[PDB]
Amino acid sequence: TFEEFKDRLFALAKKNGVEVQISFLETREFSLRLANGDLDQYTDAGKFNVEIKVLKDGKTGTFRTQVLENPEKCFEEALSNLQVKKEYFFEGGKEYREMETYVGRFEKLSVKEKMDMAKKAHESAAKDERVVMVPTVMYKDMVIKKIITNTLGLDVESQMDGGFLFAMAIARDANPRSGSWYELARTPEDLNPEEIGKRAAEEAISLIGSKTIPSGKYPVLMRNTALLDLMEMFIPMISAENVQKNLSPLKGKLGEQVGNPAVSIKDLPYHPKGLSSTPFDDEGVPTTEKFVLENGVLKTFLHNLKTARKEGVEPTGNGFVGGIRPVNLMLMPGEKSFEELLKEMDRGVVITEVEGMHAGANSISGEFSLFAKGYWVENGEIAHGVEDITISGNFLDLLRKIVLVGNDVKVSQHTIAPSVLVEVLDVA
Amino acid sequence: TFEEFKDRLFALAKKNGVEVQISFLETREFSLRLANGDLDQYTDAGKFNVEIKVLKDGKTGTFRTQVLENPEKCFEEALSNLQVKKEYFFEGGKEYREMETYVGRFEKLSVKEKMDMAKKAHESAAKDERVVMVPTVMYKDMVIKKIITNTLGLDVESQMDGGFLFAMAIARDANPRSGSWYELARTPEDLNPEEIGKRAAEEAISLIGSKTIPSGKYPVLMRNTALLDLMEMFIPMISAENVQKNLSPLKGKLGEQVGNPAVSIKDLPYHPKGLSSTPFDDEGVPTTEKFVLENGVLKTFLHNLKTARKEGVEPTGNGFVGGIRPVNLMLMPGEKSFEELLKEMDRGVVITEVEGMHAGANSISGEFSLFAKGYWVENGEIAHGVEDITISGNFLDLLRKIVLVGNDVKVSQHTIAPSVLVEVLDVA
């Protein structure tokens, strides 16, 4: 019936002098959460969405359905929405990068094995007597099948799978200390439950005996885990749409030195542990690899079909539902390990986590003011954890002050990064 | 195929000596938003979900699907989930309140008619020359059908529809002044777009010439619109689950005078404009009418099947997905108009809106610290808007301090309230 449904819709399109595009998304997911060791919550669900979009004289009309029925009613509904107020569809015939986004191994696990992974993460997080509790362990896996096809010959399909295991531990102290760790994986074999729980505990324990420090300007070694979150505020800035709308602090900066020469940031279609990796965007445009910053120089914005057509450039393959975005946004590593970065910094702050991005990070101005966790370093060694600190600045100035980049690359949902050394940052 | 799906599931349940429950949710929604008069976003979407839950020896196994096929495999999947972490289904045979939740008129409207409603609200909001712009107008309508059935004898069905229209305007001043208004209704004939637009503009225009006032303790006439929002923080407090888990400041307070004797708050299964109104909860339990507070005295918590069994009380019909909640939480009116309340207060502050509940309202402690909009009142008359006002306090202390309740009842999504006079509140 997907073929039949497609066929009926394409025949209707031709009959009515419009183009039609059909986007199909089918997902299967399993998740579970332990709360202080007890399995308190899980989901096992399958989902299915079909979007029907009709294009006439550059205007679109769109109807979304979770049922593959009544194509003519669906079509007539989309057609009627053409009046709700330029646009175009992507044609068939392009080449797409081949990528191993679907492995098929998470699907083979029994639910007992998934539970046993989560319980093992809990057990490792709980082992040390200094851990007072383990408020959360979370497991998730997902399989997703995407199809986009239209009357201009587009016909593309991709499947992706992957999973995530996360643990958070609390260590005993004057103020309780929290720690967490996660791994993203394409296959279950790449999740190490025991190591994940052990790291969450190590994280928490290392903050025991934290002290606050005087407000001031310090050199900051921002660990990968903090930078992976912070980098997300760069994503709206590099949308060509946000630039056009006067909602980006990068307008007029193409070709300028926005970052330190040490800093290159790429949009990558694929990374083995980047679970958003995909060969095409939601307009069916092949995803592309490129520098956004190349040795600190801003090379391009990211586009959808509308902004590319408007700005006279080639589509870049970044037109996703919800906004123009990178697939994997990666800060390119340099050659120093974390330990080498500590040594080079010699005296300063290490920031390992940031919190409150939603309230605290302004992508229009670049300004941020964020609660943070970290350590004091003297003589190239962590001396003690740092309590109750806030960091603030402008993300673009941060980019300017990255003087050294590590080789300890970590992957998150949409960002990938090593640790960096920032010349100086405002700490409160 | 729902009846065929059900019959096959039920037969498998019998064959395996387990119980099975099926919950069906089917929705259609249409929404639109104008951004400064330009219709720049809309949704037209149908959704469908079925949840299959199997019960064996007080354990449940759940599987959710957005496709009615392969009941045998859905059953097996739910059954395999019994391993993952007491429990009971609601049985057949109880009586439900009959209520007019589905009218069927929104669905008869054309897309152009819906578009014309939102445009008339915008025109009406933009008409006065003091309005700089009308940043948002939003229209939404929805129809929902719910079925819950199980092998104990439960078989219940309900349909609900309704709609919303909202406008926000900005008025010219040294600092721009914002105002807004919405109406919720079960039929479009009860939405008045010209009035909603005009009221948004009036709200903004009335704040022109707003002035600062000295921080301190003032009498506060809290207008229905502000109270409707504030009251939402009471909802987690009255959940029996939150009470048991030490996440409510009401633990141990049953039978105590939590509120002023002037304050009665009911949970009501139905209000004509209460769009969440429903004869049964997500467990199939009939919804019930009861005092939560009666003349200030805390009479009961709200329950789901689990909490009710645990406490040995009858289920109340408040077991909803996402937490125990009232259907329509209503502060019962007194006899005084808004104008009469102003005259009684004589001198003090009117609060018309509060902002920032998410991060500013703590339903565990009851503490709130919120941005607000309002006016200064002298000699029983509004004098001028009050600029940059924050209000703070404890929601329970506010309930104690409500000395007079108005008769100007307005409905929100889950709360229904008139305006109230609060003896004293902290204003900054």
Q: Which CATH number does the domain housing residue A119 bear?
A: 3.30.2290.10
Considering only the beta carbons, identify the residue of B81, B84, B111 that sits closest to A83. B111
**Do B84 and A32 count as a contact with CB atoms less than 8 A apart?**
yes
Q: Hey, CA dihedral for B233, B238, B239, B240, is it positive or negative?
A: positive
Helix/strand/coil for A195: helix
Three-state DSSP at B5 gives: helix
The answer to whether residues A222 and A190 belong to one domain is no
Query: Are A44 and B32 inside 8 Å of each other by CB?
Result: no
Q: Which residues of chain A neighbour B80 with C-beta distances below 8 Å?
A: 110-111
Residues of B in contact with A64 (CB under 8 A): 43-46
Q: Quick check: A115 and B48 CB within 8 A?
A: no
Contact B137/B113 with Cβ under 8 angstroms? no
User: CB of B83 within 8 A of CB of A32?
Assistant: no
Q: In the 8-state DSSP scheme, what is residue B327?
A: S
- Tell me how far apart the alpha carbons of residues A229 and B39 are, in angstroms, rounded to a whole number: 34
- B193 and B210 in a single domain? The answer is no
A325, A359: one domain: yes
Q: How was this structure determined?
A: X-ray
Q: From CA A85, how far away is CA A61, in angstroms rounded?
A: 9
CA distance B361 to B226: 13
Within 8 A by CB and 6+ apart from B84, the residues are: A32, A39, A42, A111, A115, B61
Say which of A44, A110, A112 has its CB closest to residue B64: A44
Work out the angle at residue B275's Cα, subtended by the Cα atoms of residues B273 and B281, and round it to the nearest 5 degrees: 130
Whole-angstrom distance, CA of residue B29 vs CA of residue B140: 7
Please give the residue of chain A at the shortest CA–CA distance from B46.
Answer: A65
What phi, psi does A107 have (nearest 5°)?
Answer: -60, -30
Same-domain pairing of A161 and A258: no
Q: CA B129, B134, B138: angle at the middle one, nearest 5?
A: 145
**How many whole angstroms separate alpha carbon A83 and alpha carbon A60?**
9
Residue A271: CB atoms within 10 A of its CB come to: 18
Measured between alpha carbons, how far is A80 from A61 in angstroms, rounded to an integer?
A: 7
Where among A187, A205, A223 does a domain terminate? A205
E-strand stretches of A198-327: 216-222, 265-268, 290-294, 297-298, 319-320, 323-324
Residue B209 is classified by DSSP as T
End-to-end CA distance of chain A: 61
Interface of B with A (CB under 8 A): 32, 38-40, 42-49, 62-67, 77, 80-81, 83-85, 111-112, 115, 359
B378, B345 Cβ separation under 8 angstroms = no
Cβ neighbour number for residue A91 with a 10 Å cutoff: 12
Which residues are CB-contacts of B177 (< 8 A; sequence separation ≥ 6)? B170, B171, B204, B205, B207, B208, B210, B385
| Contacts of B114 by beta carbon, 8 Å cutoff, 6+ apart | B30, B32, B139, B141
Q: Which of A161, A420, A136, A159 is nearest to A275 (CA)?
A: A161
The DSSP symbol for B206 reads T
- Name, in order, each residue with C-beta under 8 angstroms of B134's C-beta and a sequence gap of 6 or more: B34, B36, B37, B122, B125, B126, B167, B168, B169, B170, B197, B200, B201
Q: Do B81 and A42 touch (CB under 8 A)?
A: yes
CA distance B101 to B142: 12
- Closest of A32, A62, A63, A65 to residue A47, by C-alpha: A65
Q: Write out the H or E segment, with its range, that includes residue B360.
A: helix B357-360
| Gaps in chain B after residue (C–N beyond 2.5 Å) | 85
Residue B93 falls in which region: left (phi positive, over 0), alpha (psi -120 to 50) or beta: left
Residue in A with minimal Cα distance to B78 = A44
**Cα(B112)–Cα(A41) distance, rounded to whole angstroms?**
44
Can you spell out the DSSP letters for A70-125?
-HHHHHHHHHHGGG-----PPPS-------------GGGS-HHHHHHHHHHHHHHH
Buried/exposed code over B175-210 (b: 16+ C-beta within 10 A; e: otherwise): eebebbbbbbbbbbeebbbeebbbbbbbbbbbbbeb
Q: CA-to-CA distance for B166 and B82, rounded, in angstroms?
A: 45
> Residue A424 has which token pair?
């100086």
Q: What is the C-alpha separation between B222 and A46, in angstroms, rounded?
A: 46
Does B326 lie in the same domain as B259? yes
Length of chain B: 428
Residue A47 to residue B32, Cβ atoms within 8 A: no
Query: Which of A48, A111, A359 is facing B359, going by the closest CB pair?
Result: A359
* CB-CB contact of B296 with B261 (8 Å): yes
Residues A277 and A421 in one domain: yes
Interatomic CA distance for residues A366 and A397, integer angstroms: 9
In angstroms, the first-to-last Cα distance of chain B is 61
> Tokens standing for A253?
């900066």
- Do residue B63 and residue A42 have CB atoms under 8 angstroms apart? no
> What phi and psi, each to the nearest 5 degrees, are found at residue B137?
-125, 130
Q: Cα(A250)–Cα(A254) distance, rounded to whole angstroms? A: 8
| CB burial readout B323-341, b (16+ within 10 A) else e | ebbbbbbbbbbbebeeebb
Q: What are phi and psi of B227, to 5 degrees?
A: -65, -40
The shortest CB-CB distance from A85 to any of B39, B45, B83 is to B39
Query: A38 forms bridges with which residues in the sheet?
Result: A35
The residue type at B264: S
Last residue of a domain, one of A205, A238, A268: A205
Structure tokens at B91: 């049985």
Query: Residue A14: phi, psi to the nearest 5?
Result: -55, -45
Between CA A275 and CA B39 the distance in angstroms is: 35
Chosen domain end from A176, A205, A234: A205
**Chain A residues within an 8 Å CB radius of B83:** 111-112, 115
CA distance B44 to B46: 7
Question: Residues B377, B383, B386, CA angle at the centre, nearest 5°?
Answer: 80
What is the spatial distance between Cα A234 and Cα A244, in angstroms, rounded to a whole number? 16
Domain span at residue A174 reads 1-205
Together in a domain, A107 and A230: no
Contact predicate A254/A298, CB 8 Å: yes
Measured in angstroms, the CA of B52 and the nearest CA of chain A are apart by 10
* Nearest partner of A118 among A168, A161, A45, A162, judged by Cα: A168
Question: Which residues is chain A interrupted after (C–N above 2.5 Å)?
Answer: 85
Residues 6+ apart with CB under 8 A from A25: A47, A48, A49, A50, A144, A145, A146
DSSP-derived secondary structure for B368-422: EEEEEEEEEEETTEEEEEETT-EEEEEHHHHHHTEEEEBS--EE-SSEEE--EEE
> Which DSSP state fits A58?
T
Give yes or no for a contact between A129 and A169, defined as CB atoms under 8 angstroms apart: no
Cα gap B28→A66, rounded to integer Å? 11
Together in a domain, B280 and B140: no
Best A23, A32, A108, A111 residue to mutate vs chain B (most B CBs within 10 Å):
A111
Bridge partners, residue B27, by sequence: B47, B144
Calpha distance A88→B257 (Å, rounded) = 64
Contacts A111 to B, Cβ<8 Å: 80-81, 83-84
Neighbours of B72 (CB within 10 A): 11
Resolution value (Å, 1 decimal) = 2.0
**What residues in chain A have their Cβ under 8 A from chain B's Cβ atoms?**
32, 38-40, 42-49, 62-67, 77, 80-81, 83-85, 110-112, 115, 359
Helix-strand-coil percent breakdown of chain A, rounded to 5? 25, 40, 35
Q: Does B173 share its domain with B213?
A: no
Q: How far apart are CA B37 and CA B32, in angstroms?
A: 12
Six-digit token string for B413: 């999504």
What is the total count of domains within chain B? 2
Question: In sequence order, what are the residues at sequence separation of 6 or more whose Cβ sits closer than 8 angstroms to the Cβ of residue B426?
Answer: B216, B217, B391, B392, B393
DSSP result, A364-407: TT-EEEEEEEEEEEETTEEEEEEEEEEEEEEHHHHHHTEEEEBS
Question: How far apart are alpha carbons A24 and A155 in whole angstroms?
Answer: 11
Three-state secondary structure along B144-205?
EEEEEEECCCCEEEEEEEEEEEEEEEEECCCCCEEEEEEEEECCHHHCCHHHHHHHHHHHHH
* Distance between CA atoms of residues B30 and A96, nearest Å: 35
Query: For residue B203, which phi and psi values (nearest 5 degrees)?
Result: -60, -45
DSSP B231: G
d(C-alpha A138, C-alpha A123), whole Å: 13
Tokens encoding B245? 């888990």
d(CA B266, CA B393): 23
Q: How many residues does chain A have?
A: 428
Phi, psi angle pair for A243, to nearest 5°: -65, -50
B91 DSSP 8-state letter: P
CA angle B108, B110, B115 (to 5 degrees): 130
Query: Are the beta carbons of A46 and B39 separated by less than 8 Å?
Result: no
Q: What SS3 state is found at B70?
A: coil
A323-352 burial code (b ≥16 CB/10 A, e <16): ebbbbbbbbbbbebebebbbeebeebbbbb
Kindly give the pairing relationship between strand B19-35 and strand A265-268.
unpaired
Contact B179/B168 with Cβ under 8 angstroms?
yes
At which residue do the structure tokens 């006032």 appear? B213
Secondary structure of residue B318 in the 3-state scheme: coil
CB contacts of A32 in chain B (<8 Å) are 84
Residue contact B39–A84, C-beta within 8 A: yes
**Nearest neighbour of A66 by CB, restricted to B39, B46, B111:** B46
Assign residue B70 a region (left: φ > 0; alpha: ψ between -120 and 50; beta: otherwise).
left
Any idea of the CA torsion for A103, A105, A111, A117, to the nearest 10 degrees?
A: -100
Q: DSSP letters along A237-266, please?
A: HHBHHHHHTT--TTTT-TTSB-S-TT--EE
Spatial distance between the Cα atoms of A195 and A121, rounded to a whole number of angstroms? 8
Output phi, psi for A115, to 5 deg. Answer: -60, -40
Quote the tokens at residue A299.
């090379």
CB-CB contact of B141 with B114 (8 Å): yes
d(CA B329, CA B263): 13
Whole-angstrom distance, CA of residue A348 vs CA of residue B97: 67
Nearest by CB to B32, from A66, A84, A359: name it.
Answer: A84
- Between the alpha carbon of residue A340 and those of residues A203, A407, B95, the distances in Å are 20, 10, 72
Residue B222 is classified by DSSP as E
SS3 A342: helix
d(CA B258, CA B299): 10
Same domain, B275 and B339: yes
What is each CA distance from B25 to A268, B51, B52, B144, B156, in whole angstroms?
39, 9, 12, 7, 12
CB-CB contact of B249 with B308 (8 Å): no
How do the residues of chain B divide into helix, strand and coil, expressed in percent and rounded to 5?
A: 25, 40, 35
Strand ranges in B227-289 using DSSP code E only, listed in sequence order? 265-268
| Separation CA A219–CA A347 (nearest Å) | 8
Residue tagged 């029925």 (tokens): A69
- Whether residues A339 and A407 share a domain: the answer is yes
CA dist B414 to A12, A37, A262, Å? Answer: 43, 34, 54
- Chain A residues whose CB is inside 8 A of the B84 CB are 32, 39, 42, 111, 115
Chain B hits for A81, Cβ within 8 Å: 42, 44, 111
Half-sphere exposure of B181 (CA within 13 A, CB side): 21
Residue from A67, A86, A137 to probe the interface with B (highest B Cβ count within 10 Å): A67
The answer to whether residues B82 and B155 belong to one domain is yes
The DSSP code sequence of B251-263 is TT-TTSB-S-TT-
Can you read off the two tokens belonging to residue B326?
Answer: 């009232």
Helix crossing, B111-126 with B193-205: angle to 10°? Answer: 30
> Phi first, then psi: what are they for A75, rounded to 5°?
-65, -50
CA atoms within 13 A on the CB side of A347: 3
